[model samples]
Target chain A: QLKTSIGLITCRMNTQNNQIETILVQKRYSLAFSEFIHCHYSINANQGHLIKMFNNMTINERLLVKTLDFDRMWYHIWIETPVYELYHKKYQKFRKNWLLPDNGKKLISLINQAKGSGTLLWEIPKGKPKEDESDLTCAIREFEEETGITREYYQILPEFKKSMSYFDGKTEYKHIYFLAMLCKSLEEPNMNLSLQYENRIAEISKISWQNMEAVRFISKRQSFNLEPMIGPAFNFIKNYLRY
Target chain B: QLKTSIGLITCRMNTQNNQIETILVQKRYSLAFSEFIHCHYSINANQGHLIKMFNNMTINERLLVKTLDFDRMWYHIWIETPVYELYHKKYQKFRKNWLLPDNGKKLISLINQAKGSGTLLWEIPKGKPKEDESDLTCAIREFEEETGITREYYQILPEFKKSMSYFDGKTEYKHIYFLAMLCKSLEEPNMNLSLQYENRIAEISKISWQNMEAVRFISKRQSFNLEPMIGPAFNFIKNYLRY
Candidate 1:
């Protein structure tokens, strides 16, 4: 029932460590184990650095972390649209009203109809794990399941990573990103009205980039910002369209 | 008697490995151990690639080997001076005689004096093993031993790394280099006068760029045929001195 084995093991160990010295030792062991695992993973992974050189700008944020370290490498980087307020001040906006719920509804309907359809991304089973599943693996599988896209089409770029951490009076974020190129667009992204009629699901509409960007700007203001997601999406579009 | 415990361990291991597989494994292990030891000693150890680039055009007769095992992140780079030959066609009248014994004597004498008097390039003991000797430490020590210069006088340009295979097609090398700016040149490079007095050492004159190039070219052809070394040295003189 646990989401991660390491987390489960730590939780189990937490109850056993009553003494301060024992807890310290356990902490050290955990740190060592984590480092070992991270090093092991990086040995085989294709690693590279990404620099976002803004044209004609001097203010650049340099991440002060070694590439080999996970704490520095696994930061989250989100790209979001900027919203202009009445005062002409730019701010991130995140609200349900900003999203085209009607379009989402229509898209959902089409996806339901496409269920059991022989598509690449939509071919996987959805829902919580029965026996085997990982959070990262599940997220990837679900993305592929609904979109019919393979992992090969998407390249994870960690160099342009950023992080958002709002803890202990610090508001910052770490973002990890992947660029997913649409190798071949599907004829119909969402299927027909069969699943809607059978399961009482409402139909969803195709969302445009303009609308998506607006939604993303709104999400950026929220505790869970959407900038990280938008960053890679924009990158994919820019590269794919040669913009 | 063993000169040092670390040295003894490595030398003993090297001596024990006679089989091809055993030799390879021992070499890899020794290389890794040396790197690990040197890395802890100084930040300037594994910076040969930087020095190579600093010279503008020169060849590094070293090989770097990363383990195929995914669990290991440590890389083993062996440093060995390759055999070379100098072509007389380019120099014409300026070309020196094609005498192996004379060239070898001059080179060995110059190198030995540079090491003894600490006037060469990088001159600093990497670090004592008891005092947290690391991969960087060995590199620093070796660099100082060979070059009579310290890490402070130069910066390692890690971006200029190059991989090449040049001997018996046995190994691949990842040469880390450093570019050293002369803060101050010694008035007189101490020569081993004992050999000179005994008439064993040749009348070593200050080597000119032309002669150096000729020697380099000849060394490359006769020894390892490392053609890559000539370009950097040539470019350095051409760009800086307009030679």
Candidate 2:
């Protein structure tokens, strides 16, 4: 999982062409500003309102557009802007050469390297949302499906949700984790692993509860990039539970 | 701000050498694992137990040493292991060339660039701990010292503390934040900025309350590397307040 990059857009009215002139900045070292604009304007649906806001701004004032994690909600100027024209050639080149032809080569290399580490595997159960599913519902569903622990067996604390956003080569995705506590039933969760996707070839891995020490051990190994998420998570729990 | 990198050390018993043999792995792209070990053992006080643990491990089993950030509580194996022997030459070379004399060059460049962004500056009140200060006490004292908002004006929520650790080129530091709510006395804070250190030259900047939208605007501009801490903080508040 990769950290989400910030995309910042600043625009002002160009009186000569009666169009918006814009500049973009992004945090990701590899992501060009031109590519960032292309991604945003392509999916943005609030073009009308954005234009209105820009028009309302004083001549000296510029409009700022901040798009988080890249599924845009704000508008982009339709008029041919200077930034677009300047970087069009560069963007075209980037788009063409962006997708690595060595996908399998990288995948195989990663798998082989991971196998050599021999670290204990650890991950929170997670899955994508179904059609028309709310975030909470999706989380609950995924929890039950993956762990065979029903809602009745555990309490999902609505008061705690941590969102971790990442760009995983193909798309930027958000994983929202909620604080789940065991009910009065038992200390240990009854975890049953089952095949999730029908196209699965290998048997599902078993799930086991790990204490803080074991988790820290695995985290130190840098296996599965668990450190980032778990660090915040552990701190959150300690804060909330006063541990 | 930089995220904390994990330093992992694995040690196995060496019957022939009658000492511990160890291998190191670290996540920082620029950090050499040997440098990590040097940093750790230099400050580690629990070298006794660590040696004992390594000796207790079976010939086939390896003892994993996980050190978070740069500080160490666990022991490091120092029996002139194969890893130390192999990387000693490389480590010596790195140690000599690592110090950059162009400190002012980079500092000036960063200052010039930050001035160009002109993004609204936003930061939670913070400061270092005083002598014999507890974490919470330090936080409270810093709050009053920085913002002039005394303990009477706000309630510090003990149940929530989020720690963000980073290496600031010179040192690995952790900033722990607690949730503070305004008491019924005031809607907006009465901020009084004062001189922080004795050697300070510039006047303290004014502090103002910002809404989520304004904070998001500044975060998007990538002015302060504030996105990481603020994102999680916002999520925690929303979850707790059900907003």
Candidate 3:
């Protein structure tokens, strides 16, 4: 039996969007017919994926979508007015051949660094009405299919799950997260050779806990390049090791 | 503002009807079975009221009824199965005044002692649905009219409300209780001594907490007689002395 001493764990996403051009504010002292606007809208965009990913992309994807705002672009919104202005004024000179990361990448990197190894399985199909399952159920099911373990055999720590939104008047992104536990040890996962699909080559690999700092650095520099694999990889590390 | 340290009080009625009869078991055990039948019938009639009283009464009343039956009727049915056989062997002594104390006298005395100098109001009506209020609401309204005090100024101690039931196999008598907290001081109580109905007169009366022992004693004697006037009387003491 899985020991119950396992503490609550959560996955979180930090999202930032660059949308508004100018955030206008009235002068504090001018109450009668004074039209003055404040300038505080220049900020870098930080985006990430809201929900986690599973191995079997088809069935579990719908569940995650149901748990999150599948139809909407973002799930929840959070505004950082002063923080964005401060960051923009202080660190705007650091741009070097920069490529903006999708909302999924930024979130996955933050969660992975905090708890590590999340997978970004975004290519899965959306759920239909006949299946009738929640995103949590679907995510658990997908994790089992990929890892070969049932949820009942292990516990899913819920304290680690977190959602946040970042907006700048033009764009918004809502992020959802989940933290799952592993029930059994795996023998070098064969991502390339699986019986489920014939002649299908899998890009399977594993990351060590010591390498998380390097992953975080790569995430901040090139988030969009690895958005697809971040969520599942992060969850894998969170389940296998304690941070 | 009311204090959190509030108490709930309720009443129960354990009724008995000795008119019911019993049948025998087999020919070989005829003599023993006849004695068993007599005692069983008597106790069965008593136990049925115990069940009916618990089931028909309100939640507060059921709690009080269970407390009353816990030692006597309840224990006899559950723990004292052998006592039936012993009582059967001496059937003559077992049948003498099995009713013990008259239910009406025991209930009235308990109420009168609990209320102490609090007047009893009768013939108003029993079990009749009020125009647009509950039984307790009607009782409070009647108390205000008789004493000339505005009912709005006073608060009803909901914790002290109770209901109980007694049965004769076919009919059941459910008694509802209401303990009103008088808002005004005892010295400033509303009284109407000139009223023609002498029994409906209000007086600045006092009841000792010691009287609760008598009420408990009479309740244990299986009495089902409770006077409606005892309600206002108990409310008076509880309000003035903070009992």
Candidate 2: CAPRI quality band: incorrect
- Candidate 1, residues A11-43: lDDT per residue as tens digits? 001123321100000000112222322232232
lDDT of each: 0.24, 0.37, 0.29
Q: Report the number of the highest-lDDT candidate.
A: 2
Residue-level lDDT of model 3, residues B134-206, one tens digit each, is 6665655555433444555456656554555566575565555455543443322212222122222222111
Candidate 2 lDDT for residue A111? 20
lDDT of 1 by residue, B1-243 (tens): 112211100000112332110000000122223332233223243444322221221100011111111112121121111211221231221113112335334322222221000011111112224456653455555444322344554444222322233332444333322222233322222221111121111111111111233334334323233235334433442343342
Supply candidate 2's per-residue lDDT for B33.
27
In terms of DockQ, which candidate is strongest? 2
Listed models, DockQ each = 0.01, 0.01, 0.00
How are the candidates ranked when ordered by lDDT, highest leading?
2, 3, 1
lDDT of 2 by residue, A157-203 (tens): 56666776766587776767666555434322311321122111011
Model 2, runs deviating above 4 Å: A1-243, B1-120, B188-203
Determine the TM-score of chain B of model 2: 0.45
Candidate 1 ranges beyond 4 A from true positions: A1-243, B1-138, B152-159, B167-176, B187-212, B215-217, B233-243
Residue A102 error, candidate 1, Å: 99
What RMSD, rounded to one decimal, does every model reach? 29.5, 24.6, 33.3
Interface RMSD of 2: 27.8
